[PDB]
Amino acid sequence: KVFGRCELAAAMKRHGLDNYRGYSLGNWVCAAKFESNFNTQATNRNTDGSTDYGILQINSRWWCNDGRTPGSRNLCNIPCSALLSSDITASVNCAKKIVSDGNGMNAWVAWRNRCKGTDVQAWIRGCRL
Ligand SMILES: [Cl-]
Ligand SMILES: [Cl-]
Ligand code: NA
Ligand code: NA
Incomplete structure (x- = not known):
């Protein structure tokens, strides 16, 4: 499945990623965009x-x-x-383990190079959450 940006944000929010280990939702959406272009x-x-x-x-x-x-x-x-x-359940549950392993979201090289230090809240702007 290829998710829409807001659809993915909602799904990740329902699965408890919003502020998980202090990473706001836009961080997870930004990482997914650059890792997979939202394609499962x-x-x-x-x-x-x-x-x-x-x-x-x-x-x-x-x-x-x-x-x-x-x-x-x-x-x-x-x-x-x-x-x-x-x-996305299995992806999300595994991602919670990874982000908890000591390096935070730096585990995702695309997040470090494309999201970290940017206005990540732009990725959920406009969405009904
Ligand atoms: Cl193997
Ligand atoms: Cl990269
Ligand atoms: Na995945
Ligand atoms: Na393996």
Whole structure:
């Protein structure tokens, strides 16, 4: 599924991401825009052989099992394919674990380079939340 900006904001809000670990909603929307262009089916392969999955581009080196990333962990305890669902629950629940791991949203390189230090509230302006 390709979400609209406000539709995604609402879904993330219902799933408890608004101010989760002090990151306001616009941060999560901004990260999703630049990671996946709001497409839940996005995948991208990394040089190390790991793959990033879903709206928030969660990596198979640490967080999910795809059966093809040798020596990897599965800290969210989920198949990576679950991250591609139109239902964002699994992505959101895993993202809460990642953002809690010490580095905050800096775990998402697109957030650090494209969102951090910008007016992120612009990403939810106009939305009915
Ligand atoms: Cl694997
Ligand atoms: Cl980037
Ligand atoms: Na994801
Ligand atoms: Na893995």
